[model samples]
Each structure stands twice: as structure tokens, then as C-alpha cells.
Target: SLKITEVKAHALSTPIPERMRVKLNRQMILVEVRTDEGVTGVGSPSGPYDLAVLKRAIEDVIGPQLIGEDPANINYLWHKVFHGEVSRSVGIAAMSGVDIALWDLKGRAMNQPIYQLLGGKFHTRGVRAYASSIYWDLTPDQAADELAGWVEQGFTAAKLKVGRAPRKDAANLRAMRQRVGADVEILVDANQSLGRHDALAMLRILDEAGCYWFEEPLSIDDIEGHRILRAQGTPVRIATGENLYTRNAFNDYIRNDAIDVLQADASRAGGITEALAISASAASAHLAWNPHTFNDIITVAANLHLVAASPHPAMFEWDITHNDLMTRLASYDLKLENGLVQPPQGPGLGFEIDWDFVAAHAWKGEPA
Candidate 1:
């Protein structure tokens, strides 16, 4: 009685513009799952480059094993496709995108929100987000002006790019702080920019500047560097996690006391179920639940639900007006009221993407 009708696939190009200095260029591969009953579910099964990587791993490498299963029974579908060797060794992130999309489809079909299914009840008026991006738009003065602009519009905290030379980065931070004032929360990203000695070397410099968290002070997998920095750096906490794909990977960081804050991406860190597990793990570790998100309002909405429901206190990454999506692709409903973003209260995810707009900006993709 159940029959899969049609499968359509497409990608959303680089939502980021050419002017920004961000290193990674990404896209989104969306899958539309339709049935004979005029019921359709949508999912972002693969992010631009992420999808390509996953396609190779699944379709070319192992997809022959999953030719005719129901993508509808998502949990069964997930295991049927990636339960053993491939997922355990190579990774489970790519497969997760499909799971998230399937969940979205299920939510849309039932007319229920995913958060409700997750048993979420706590409500935050809105979450405070740090405007995560590059400070290259202008000099420190102009940068401070930009941050003040967000403040004027009602943002209490903003992240500043500071992985450059110690003295210059220090000067920039101090200047921006001076312009923006001490009341605003100022967090810094080191871009995994230092070695052990170099990170330890900057402890006093960052401490003197009153920076909040030293994000990625060393490398992605450098727990030892994190341990050293955690001990030697200012009372300032070191934060990381956007690149991590699973809770098991996070075990090393959590057990070793490597990170002071945890940030994961909804699009990359498996589905909401896994993210919830990770957030709970972070909570157990006494870490704050900060998340990294990008693109249109969907990611923001998805993360808002997650952050609001987190077992611990949480904050989200505000892409601000950085990309074209800030206004072009974003929804008016996603705006921050008094520096807080109200969670999407509608049925399902309460958001949609203008595929026409995506077609206009879709990039083939350049991951690195």
C-alpha cells in the first residue's frame, strides 16, 4: 500500500558572499521525499560538500546494501544504511543529514514540531547569540561601529575575530572593547591559531583584555593543548565543538576536561536526538551549551529549539548581517526581540526555503 513516488535532488549555493574571509565554502543538497497520497516531506540530507562526500561513501561505497528500504521508518533506515564498519570508522555525520531530513518529513507529515516529539517543555524568552564571523569588514573602529550597530538593534554580546599576531590582535580587541564598552560580552576565536607555547604565551595578554572564551586556541584534536591552555589561560574558558560529528568523539574532550564550553551544529552533528545527547553530556561536564549555526532561518530555528530545550543554559551563534541570507533569505519572523530570538512556535520547523533564491545563489562548492 505504501509506495515511494519520486525523488528530487538539488543544492543551495554559497550563502556567503565573496567579500568575507571565511575559509570554508559550503552548499546544501536537499532531498524531497514524496508519496502517492500527495504527502511530501523535505530534508537537507547533505550540506553542499558534505552531501558529495556522503554520496561517495554511501551510494558508491555502500549504498548497494540499501536499495529498497523505507526511508520513512528513519531509525530503521539509518541502521539499515550505516550500522557497522562504514559509520563506525569513516563517520556517521553524512548519514545523519539524511536522518534529520527524514525526521523533518515525519514532523511535517504529522503536523507536530520536532521539539515536541523530543519532549521539550522549557521555554526561553529568547537566546542571546554572539554574532559569529570575521572582523575583516573594516578596521577595529569600523568593526566596533558594526558591533555597536547590532547592539543598537538589541544584541548584548558579539564575537570578535582575534587570531592574528598577539600584539595587533590585542590592540584590536582593546580598541573594539573601548568603542563598544565593557558591558558587552566579548568572546574571541583563536582559529586554532596557536601552538602550546604560543597559546600559553598569550594567557596574560588575553587575561589582561578580559576576553571571555578562547575558542579553538590550538587544533581541532589537540586535547593536550586544550588541557595546557585550560590550566594556564586566564579564568577565560576555552570553547570548541562545531566540527565534531558525534558524542563518542566528544568523550575524549569531556573526560579530559578539555573544553569549557560546547558548540555543535544541527546540520552537521547528526540529528536533534544525537545533539540532545551531546548537550546533556556537556551539561554533565559543567560546560555551557553554545551552538554554531549558519545560513537561512531554518538552521537558526532548528538550533533555537535545541538551545531552548538544552538541559543546561545555552546561547546560539548569530550570523548577523554577515551573509546575503541575513536579509535576502531570512524570515521576518526570525528577528530578535530585545536581543533574544523567540523559538519558532509554528507546527513542524515553522520555516521554509525559497528554492528560487537558492537557485540564483547555488554554488557548485569549494569546501576548503
Candidate 2:
């Protein structure tokens, strides 16, 4: 049993396009767990976190508990961390990222890949991936041009960012549909930028344009709004889940019949355990399980494994944009042929971390 000594975090701000909103431009924070035995594991949540808070909790709360614990007993260790009054009050999403790091440490200790540790590989090579090509920068014609390019990349489906005023969204959809020529599947994410009546109007526009699905038209808390939108049309599936925190948060979406598609991140939606339950809930409701995630490789691999196991998970978000850090850090290089992410086969998540890149780009967070 190696006593866990300390945990640290690296916060790095990766620049993003102006087209996306200010809040969407997230910074990455990598969580590291270290032990006396010279073994370390890393975990990263998708969005920015208060570094001081995270740092304090890890060193004072989590680190002391990890001491003299068997990292090899992944479940037992996870249970020990999870089973308590104080632990339950903390955000599960935040803790989940840390939990993932612990699992990574366990995998490294046993010299087993996380997927192998989880059970075994389901598919090796690829999974279907949708390009996130929709942006605030592109004009209708320009956006159409961009959509056409993804089509050339062999992507038959894609997620478009919308709701920057309904007319603009409509025009963009029209141009995109025309560019893709009808065979392409289009998923529109308002990013929670729409109201009940406004979202309904936007979906009406999309239904006419043959858009495949509508996402987060209303606030995550607004099940009533989603149900209202769902009643408005069946032309497209309703998709959401990423904003939710845990099983309790997401199960409400299912119970309300608020969505036809489920999109949960392994990090935010609560590690594999909660994600699996989310999949089951969505499956029972006959909703398409599609997880939206950041561009980091670890979370991507985590999601891919969970998706492979889920009977649902119709599609996975594939970020094909050209970014320096995202490209080098993830190194997933997972093949995407004709709009599909080929199943991955390596050890844990089938990836090799570039420590130099991570260390080079590592950061510490401060209030914005």
C-alpha cells in the first residue's frame, strides 16, 4: 500500500475562436495524484475550476486519506473516498475528475490499461464522430463552405452552434443544409441560448430545413421549456445533458420526457458509474445517447469506453479543429473514416500521454 503524498493541478488557458461565447472559452486544469512510491496519476475536468480551492482540498482532504491506501484496489479506494458525509456534499463532478486520476494511478500501478481494468475492450479502432464545425465567425455562405469541407472529410453528421438570434440561425441552417445536400445529419446546439417560444420558433425553422436534432434550446433547469419545445415538433430529436451535474440532475431530464437524445461527459456527468446509469435511463426512454466532451484525450478515451459499453451512444463529438495544444496533448490520432471514430485498442484508453507537452502547457488558475 502506497501512502498518497500530494496532489497538484495545472491550469492552462487555450485560446479559442471569437465566434464562441466568452464563457465557452474554457481553461484546462489537470489534477495530479502522487504517492510516496514515486507513482502519479493525472485527471482533468473539461472546464475551468477555482485552482486555490482544488489545490487546498487535494492536499488537505484527499491526500491524507490516500496515505497507506492500496491504489491497486480501485473500487475499494473509490468507495472509501465516496462513502462519507463531507464527501457527498462536495460536487460529484469535481470529485469525479479526481477519481479518474486515481483510476489512472491504479492502471499505471497494475500496468493495466483503464479499459482493460474496467473490463475489456469492446471495439478497437474507431467510433462515429461528428465534427463541431458550427461557429459564430462564419457567415451563411462561409459556414456552408465550412460544412462542405467537413463533408469532404467524410463526415456525414455534425454539430452546429446556433441561437445567435433566430434568423441568423435559420439562415445558417439553410445554407448548411444546402451545402451538405440533404444526406448529411445536422445537430444544432443553441448552447442554452434560447427561450421557450424562441426555441420553439428556432426548431420550426430547423424542422423545415431538415436539421437532424435540436440541443439545449432552453436552460438545463427548464424541463418545462424542453417539454414545450418537444411538443412543438418531431422533425428533430431533442438533445441535452452536458450541463447536468450527476445522476440526480440528469434523471430529471429523462423523467420529464424532455429530450430524445442524451449527451453526458465522463467528467461532468460523473465518472463511468454515473454515466452508465445515465445510459440506462436514456435507453429505457429510447433516447439516443450521445456524449459531448472537450478535446482532451483522457476524457475522450474515458467517454469512448463508456460509449462502447452503452447500448445507446449513437454518436460522439469529434473536435477536428486546428489547435496547437489540443492536437499535441490528446494525441488520440484515432482514425475517422467517413464520419466515424474507429474504435480504440491500446491499453488504458489506448493513449500515450505526452508528459513534455502537459508539463510545458501546465498552469495554475486564478480568478478571471
Candidate 3:
């Protein structure tokens, strides 16, 4: 039996873009599980307010519990470590990382890619990848021009951030529709910043522009409001769930019929095991599954595999931004080609990690 020899945690940090008011650094936490047999796995939990704090939780609280255990007992270990029914601790972030790493280790041990273990490929064709840029902060001209440029890059679909100021956001989205023309599938994300009425008002305008989907315009907690908006039966499809944690929250979203599409994030939703379960639930509910992605290269690879295995997959959110961490940490073949992405062919998460890159950005938090 292969026993866990070590568990370690680290993080990477960079300056936040000046245009944002939140003032949070661009960061993500990584957990590594090394076994006695020399097989190892890496995972990360993201969407945290502070990576440094999460790093400590992984190293100090969670890492100690799994040092001598078997990495293959993923499900048992996950529940064994999680005390309460709901996982509210920052340790959930660490556990998310650990969960994914164990999956990676298992796949490598079996000499198969993660998708093969997740129940094989859904289809041989490349998954539809949407060019996701057009941040809310950009001026209409900038957003329009950028959307046009992605079109030239062979992306037939893209997403623009909306809901900053209704008038300006609508104008920018409207201009983007015109800029991309009618053929390109244009999606919009509000980042969960609107009420039902305001979101409905925005949807009214977006409906005319032929927007493909309306994402998270209302708060995630307002399940009633979500159902109310969807109940309107507008042309725009409702999509959310990235902020949600674990399968229970997703169960609430799924049961409520509050969304038309689910944006499950493996990094944020207890990693691969829960992500697959979430995708399965979305499929059974007849909702489209579009795996949400943010953070580093590890997340990109994980989302790609998840989407490939999903039965009812939608446009995979491709972060069109140029982050050094994503480009450097793991080499990926998945690129924007006519808005379609070819999944990686390698084993495990299907990408090569650059440990040198990780070492350079090591978390400088307090001693564990």
C-alpha cells in the first residue's frame, strides 16, 4: 500500500489590477501530497480573499492530518477530515487542494488521464471554448475593440462583464454585440451584483442584443429571486454557482431550478470529486454544465478535464488574460482556435508543471 509521506502547502501572489476597487492580490494556494512510492499529486482551493491565510490553514491544520495516510482513499479521507456537515473552515480550501492532488496521484498511479477515470470522454470532438475577457472596468471602446480582436483570434464566442453601472454596462454590452456581429455567441457576467428588478431591467436590454446567457446578475443567496428571474422565461438563460461550496449548496441550486447553466469550479468546490458529482447532478437536472475557471494553470487543466467528461457540456470559460503563472506553471496545448479547445493528451491532469515557477513565488507566510 502506498502511504502518504508528506503534505505541503504554498501560495503565489501578484498585484491586483489598479482598475479594481476590491484591492485583493491575484493569488491561489497549492497543496502537494507526496507518497512513499514517489507518486505525488497537486491541488488548490481558490476564490479566497487571502491566499496567505489559506496557505497557513493548509500547512498547519490540514497537512498534519494526512501525512501518513493513503492518498487513494480520497472519499473516506475527505469526509474523515471534514468535521461538520458543512465545510466552512479555510481548511476546506486546503482540502480542495488535497482532494485534487489525490486524484492526480491516483490517475498517475493508474497511468491514465483524469478524464478516463471520470468515465471516459463525452465526445471525440473538441470542447467549445469561449473567449472570456471584456471586464466590467473597460470602456465601451476598449471592450468593443477587444471583442473584435478575439474574433480575429478565431473565437466565435466571448463573455463580457456587466453590472457596474447599468447604463454604461448595457451600452458596452450592446456595442460588443454590434462589434462581434450577430454570428458570435456573446455571454455576460454580472459577478452577482444586482437585485432581481435591476437584473431584469438589464436582461430586458440584453434580450434585444441577442445575448447568449445572463450570469449571476443577482446575489447567489437569493434563490427565490433567481427562480423569479428565470420564471419570467426571458430569452436570456440564467447561470451561476461558482461562489457556491460543496455539493449541498449545488443541491439547493439544482433543486430550486434557479439556473439554466451551472458554472462549477473544481478549485472552489472541493476539487475533482465534488466537481464530477456536481456535473453529474447538473446533467440529471437537464442543466448545461460550463465549468467555471479562475486562478492558476492547475485550475485550467482541472476544468478542461472536467468539461471533457461532462455529458452536457457548454462553452468552457477560457481566461483570455495573460497571467505569467498560468503560462509558466503548466504547459497547455489548449488554445483559442475558432472558439474550440482540444483537451490535453498527457496522463493525470494532462499538463506538465514547472516546479521552478512555483518555487519562485513560494508563499512568505508565517512559519508552520
Candidate 4:
């Protein structure tokens, strides 16, 4: 039966970014799902903005429910956690780590990569990987230069963060478009920082730049606004779902026709089981999946497997930002070639965690 033995949680901290002291924190919640047979799988949540909350949710709410259950009964156990407690996205997102770990266990137990274990080969070609950078507030000159470097490094597409201010944001998009030219697939993210009306204002500029998609133009809560935006005939497609939790959330967007591309962050989207469900709905709705990525290589690994399993054409969000934690703790070579990325060859999430790096970065609940 391989009865589960334990579930433990740990936190890692990275140097916080400038001017984001209150708005952001660099942290991650790494969870372990262990079975009595001695197999142990590891996972971490996305954003990891609040380590204390994630840590408490896992240690107090999730770990208890997971112990003594069959690790392979991932679907049942996931419902057990999602239905009983874990009301908010925080708890549900916390559940993502444990859920992912269990999937890792299943894949390892079966001696297959998670993609094959989930659903064999959904595409003939490798999933396209976009170099995602130009975070909100970076200068146009800086972003254009960075993305030119990315293009040279083999990325066929790139994304920029806009919504700083409409006029300035438009100018930035124009500058980057002129810099990268027409061949590159350029995308933009508003970080849900715009209203329906104002978002359309920015979308007009992005559309002129031939931007492929306009992501998170409005808040996730603004389903009606998204509807209005989608119906407005903007040239750019709306892509969201980074913060949207489960099938019901996605179902709302699908019904509203608010999202054109569903960006489920595997680390945050109730893990692979619910991701597949979301993928199913996305297919039925004729929506594309472009799983979001942020923090940790596990998130990247999980997204790669998920994309490989998706029947729909999927694009992966590849974080081009500098993250020492991702580089050191991941123990993997996740490189992009001609804008497409190859999935890892090993079993499970195809990652080997560097415990030493974890030990070096492990947070004990204090400012670093």
C-alpha cells in the first residue's frame, strides 16, 4: 500500500528586491511527502510571498490530513484536503506543494517522468518557452536591451510588464517593439493592475506593437470586467489564472469568456490533478494553457511536465529574472533552444533537489 509516513514543511528565503519591502518578500514553502516504503517526494509553492502562512498551513492544516494515507491515492487525498478545510487560495495553494509531492512520488514509484505518468505525449514538438521578464517598473531601455539579449540566447518570444502608467507604458511597449521587431512574439502583463476601461487603453498600445497577449489586464475578481474587455475587440488576447485556484475559478472565467489563455501555476493551482481538470475545461472552452512560473525550479519542472501532458497547444512561462535560489537549489539545466524547451529526461518532476543549497537558504523566520 505504501502507506504515507510523514509530511514536513520547510521555508527558503532570498534577498528581497529593492522598493518592494512591503509589497514583496522572497520566500518559498518546500513540502515533503514521504511513504513508509522510504520514497520521499519534494515540492514548493509559487510566489512564496508569505512563508509563515504557507508553513503554518502545511504544518497545521495539511500535514495532519496527509499522514497515514496512501501517497498514490493522490486524487482522493487531494479532494480530502480541498473539501474538508483549506478554504482560501492560501491554504489551497499550500495544498499544491503536498499534491505535487505526491505526484512526484507516483511518478518515481512508476519509474516514469511525470508527463508520461500523467498522460503520454500531447504534442509532436516541444512546448514553446518564452523568456518572461521586464517586471513592472523596469525602464524601456533596460527591458529592450535585456530582451535583445534573450533573443540572442535563443528565445523566440518575450514578455514585458506594463501598467506603470498608461502613456509611459505605451511608450515602453513601442520602444521594445521597435527594438525586437516583428519576428518575435511579444507579450505583456498588467499584473491585474488595471480596470476594464484603463486596461483597454493600454491594450490599444500593445496591439499596435503586435503584442501576442495582454495578460492579467484586470484583477481576477473582475470577471465582468474581463468579459467586457474580451468583447471589446482588442487585438491582444487576455491571458490570466496565475492566482485563480481551482476548476470552479477557471469555470467562471470560461463561462464569462474572460480568458483566452489559462495560465495555471502548477505550484499554486492545486497541483497536477486539478491542473488536468482545468486543462480539460480549457480544451472544451477552446482556450489555451500557458502555465505560469515564478520562484523555484520545481515550479518550472512541474510546468514542463504539465505542458507536455496538455492536449492543447501550450506555451510555458519561463522566468528570465535572476533568482539564485532557482539556479542553486534546482540542480537542473533548464535551457531553451530556438524558443522551445525540452522536458527533463528523468523520472517524476525530473529534478534532484540540492539539499545543501536548501540548508544554506533555509529560513528560520527572520530577516536575512
Candidate 5:
């Protein structure tokens, strides 16, 4: 039996590039689970939560709970941490980090890729990917040029951040559509920055602009507003759910007929176990599941494994920005070719971590 020995959650901080208009959280938590058999697995938890808080949730709270347990019983261990004591966003994020590591351990034990254990590749030709964004700070012309460059690199789909104003948002979508031409699909994400009325207005304009989807046009809490938008007879699809923490929260949106596309993040939505449940729920509701991935490469790899096994796999979200955590923390680089990326075929999550880089970026907070 592979007895759980130690669970270590390391906090890392890397420099963010100055080119980004909106700086994201630079600190991330890397979860490593060690076994008595000398095998170890790696995973991460993400979102805009406090780094110290997240680190303790894993090291001080959830980590101690798994001591001496069997890492092979993923579902059992998942519920143990999920239903135990720590709860909500922070608790789920903590569980996600450990849960993903356990999956990695299972795959490594079986000498198969995580995707194969999840059920084998659903999309054999590789999963289609889209540039996660042209930042909202860019002008219409700038956004157009940016997306056109992505199209040149073989990306058939791309997303744009909108919500500057109804007119400006419309212009940005129009500019991208015209520049990329009808062959390329364009998506717009407002990041829950607009009100219902403004979102409704933008929906019509997005439909006219041939937008593939309008994401988080309203606040995350407003499921009723989303349902109303979906019922407005507009052809544009309403996409959201990145901020939701569990399958239950996503079920509420699906039951209410609120969204057309489900954008659950595996790292935040309770790891791959809960993400599979969420995807199954979305499939039963006949909704599309496109995971929201913007964190480091670990999160991207986890989502890729999920998408590879999903029956209703939509385009993967590839963050094309300069994030050191994504670019420098792993020895493996995503193989993006002709708008699709092949999931790592190696054992476990299939990538080797750069421990040297981790050492350099290790978080050193002041004495408490």
C-alpha cells in the first residue's frame, strides 16, 4: 500500500510583466503529495485569494487530514477533505490542489497519462484552443492587430475582454471580426463588469458582430439575470461560471437555463473530480463546457486532461500573456499546432516541475 507520508504546499511569487494592463496575482500555491513508496505528485490551487491564507489551508488544515490515508482512493479522499471541516472557496481551492496531486499519483502508479485514466481521449485530433484574451485596455485597433497575430499563428478562435462601454465594446468586437475575417471565431468576456440592461444591449450588438459567445456580462451572483439574457432571443451564447466553486453552484445556473456555455475552472471548481461532475451536469442539460484556464501551466495541464476526456469538449482557453509561473515553472511546453493542442501523453500530469525556479521564486513573508 502507498501510504500518504507528507503533503507540502509551497508558496511562490514571480515577477509580472509590465506590459499587462491589469496585473493578476503573482503568488501561487504548489501542492506536493509524497508517499511512503517514494513517489510524489504535484498540483496547484488558484484564484485571487490571499496567498498566505491558501498556503495554510493546504499545509496547516487539509494536509494533516490526509496523513496515513490511501491516495489511490481519489473519490473517497476527495469527499473526506471536501466534506470534512474547511469549506467554501478557500477550502475548495485547497482541496483542488491536493486532489489533483492524488490523480497524478494514480496515473503515475498505473504508468498511464491522466487523460487515459479519466477515460481516454474524446477528441482524438487534439483539442481546439483559443487565445484567452486581447486585454480590455487595448484600443479597437490594437485588439484587432493582436488577434490577427494569433490567427497568423494558426489559432482559429480567440477571446477579447470588453465592457469599456457599449459602443466601445461593440467597436472592439467589430474590429476583431473584420480583421480575423469570418473564418475565425471571436469570443468576448466582460468579466462580470456590466449590469443586466447594459449586458442585454451588448448581447444584441454581439450577435450582430458574429460573436461566438458573451461571457460573464453580468455579475457572478446574478443567475436570474443570466437566464433573462438567455431568453432574450439573441443568437449569441451566454458563457460564465469561472468564479463558481462547486458543482451545486453550477447546477443552479444550469437548472435555471441561465447559460449556454459552462466555463468551470478545474482548479477552483473542486479539482478534476468535481469538474467531471460539473461537466456531466452540463452535458445532461445540453450545454457546452469550455473550461476557464488562466493560471499557471499546471492548471492548464489539468484542464487539458479534463477536456481530452470530456464528451462535450469545447475550445481550451490558452493564456497568451507573459506569466512566468506558466512559462518558467515547467519543463513541458504546450504543443499548439493549427489551433489545437495535444495533451501531454506522459505519465501523470506529464510535465516535470522546475524546482530550481521554485526555489528562486519561493515566497518569503515577514516574520509573523
Candidate 6:
């Protein structure tokens, strides 16, 4: 019975401190949904290229359509924006933000956590958390040391960025393995920087090094290439789908047996509504749905809830970088005990925004 009254989008930006070895733009688009019953919910959308475009799509296009509709009708509203007008990355990203807000609103109205609303905690113990990266700038030794530090901090799994050089990539993995020992799991991500031949060669190297998974080795569109890599009998798992939009797009990869793991991002893949669909498809195909969550803390919470509700055994991608948005923007303190993270127990996304911090780092506009 809660009627949508207003929708607003906030553009936030901050500078990544020099401590981080990689250069990244710290821009985020936050969508807010207010209801007639005085309940307000917030969600963040991921689009680093042009925050303005995403903001406009939410505030002007998608948000307007939600006015007067019931926030409880999440699936109906998701289709309203998805099938009605928005489709591709931009529109889906915009709708995803709004849809996330609606889910948050629903949780608050029902006085329950988003994961509980999706389904009871499927992973009764807790979801495994993996340290996202060892950064590209670090040398093999530095990367190994970093992984060792994370291991000491209770992370049983870690990921490393590789693709600049194939030989060096294998060397780094070997070094990390030696440092972390066989007890810890290591995953490698190429960020789609390799061709089929190069990916095949790297997979062979990864297989030898006992790499957990090869993420985004080739272009997202090359389904056939991924199929070929899977067919080659490499023991390492092929992981992709972070750039993919909807369940339909992911189905192409699923039907063709292109990927061993589905790394869908809730912030970009049409929010929790569509993400559930994608998760179902992956589970039905007998694949693990480990949501890609390298954005802000809100996205981290959303993906965590998704992982908690899903039936498949999944891992949480914890960004081990010096990101202000992940650390300073929300009041949610991530609790990790021996590499496992329990879903936030609070209602909705289970995190409160630090409005003071948001005001201080709010994006004003483009320079003159």
C-alpha cells in the first residue's frame, strides 16, 4: 500500500588517495525512493564513464515512471522500466538503481532484511569472502607479500589482476601460491585484455599454477571463444558475465557452456530483481553465481544479500583497495571472520549512509 511519491538521484565524487597503486575515478550515482508513507530507501548504480547520463536517466526517465506506483510491486515495476522503455546498459543501469531502492523500501516496510525478503539465509554458516586483488602495479614479490598479508588477516581466498604480460602473469601466480601455500585459493582476472590464443595459453599456465578461476580473459561478446576455451580441457574455471546486462544476455553464455561461473553485478544488471533471475539461471545450469561487487559499499551489501539468498555456494568479492566510497560512505562495518562474511542483519540493504560525508564529497558538475 506504500505509494511512490518521489525519486531523486545524487552524484557523488571523491579523489582516490595516492596510497592506492591503481588510478580510478571515484564517482557514484545514488538513487533514492520516497513513498507516501514517509519511508525512504537508497540504492547505488555503477557507471563510471558519465555519472550525469545515469543520473538523468534515473531522475528524468525511469524515476518519473515509478511515481504513484506501489513500491511493493518490485517485479512489475522492474518490467515496467525494463520492457517499457529502458533496455541496454545505460537504461538497465538506471533502472537497476531504482529497482534496488524499491527492494530497500520493501524491506523497511516489512521490517526485515533484504536477504530474508529474497529468501531465508541459504548459507546458514556464512558466505566466503575473497580479497579482490593484489593490484597491477605491484611486482611478483609485492603481490605475493600482499596476498600473504591478506591471508594473515583471515582471507582464505584472493584475486590478482594479470594480462599485461602472460609470462609475468604466471610467475606472479606461482609466487603468490608459494607465499600463500596450497591452503589459500587464488583467482586471476584479465579484464578482457586477451585474445583467444593468448587466453588459451594463459589458461594452461593458470591450470598448472592451480589458479581457481580465469576471469574475463576474452571479450564479453565472444561466446564461441569462451566455449572453445572451456572445451580445451583446462582445469581452471572460466568466469565472466560482469559486463553482461540481463538474464537473456547471460543465457547466451549459459546455453553455450561459455563460463563456469556467473559474475553478475546487481548494480549494473538490473538490480536484485533481474539478478535473482540471472542467479536462478546459473543455478539451474549448475554454475556458481558469485556477484561482481567492486563498487561502493551499498553495492557490496546488495551483492551480499543476493549471495545469501541464492542456493548455490558463492563467494563475496571484497575490494581490498583503498576506496573511500567503500569505507567512508556507509556506516556498515564489514564483519569478516576467517574469510567468511555474514549478510547484514538490518532491514533493507542493512547499511546507513553517512549523509555528512556525502554532502562533503558531493559532485557539483563539470568544469568550465
> What is the C-alpha lDDT profile of model 6 across 1-368, one tens digit per residue?
88999999998887666666475457888788999989989998875747888888888888878999989889899878877766547778788788889888888888899998876898888989999887676678988998999989889999999898888888888889988788898999999999999998998989888888899999998999999988987778899978998788899999998989999899989898889888988888999899898888888888889898788876679987877888898878767876789878888988787889988877877321
lDDT for predicted candidate 5 compared with the true structure = 0.86
Model 3 CA deviation exceeding 4 Å by range: 16-24, 84-89, 365-368
lDDT of 5 by residue, 131-247 (tens): 878876667898899989998888899998888767877777788888878889888899899999999888889888888889998999999999999998687889998888888
Model 6: lowest-lDDT 10 consecutive positions: 16-25
Candidate 5 segments exceeding 4 Å error: 366-368
lDDT at 324, model 3: 57
User: How many clashes (backbone N, Cα, C below 3 Å) per candidate?
Assistant: 3, 13, 2, 0, 0, 0
Candidate 6 local lDDT, residue 21? 47
Candidate 2 residue lDDT tens string, 277-363: 777777877887788776466667667777765556457787666554456775567466656675345544455667787777544
* Candidate 3: residue 40 Cα off by (Å): 1.2
**Candidate 3 residue lDDT tens string, 268-312:** 778788888888888889988787887777777787887887778
> Ten-residue segment with the worst summed lDDT in candidate 4?
18-27
Candidate 4 lDDT by residue in tens digits, 12-83: 887767754323345777788888899888887777557888888887898888888888889899889988
lDDT of each: 0.64, 0.70, 0.78, 0.81, 0.86, 0.85
TM-score of 1: 0.85
What is the lDDT for 154 in model 5?
83
Per-residue lDDT value at 348 in model 5: 94
- Over 4 Å off in model 2, which ranges? 1-5, 15-26, 35-39, 85-90, 109-112, 117-125, 364-368
Q: Give the local distance difference test score of model 4.
A: 0.81
Task: Identify the superior model by lDDT, candidate 2 or candidate 3.
Answer: 3
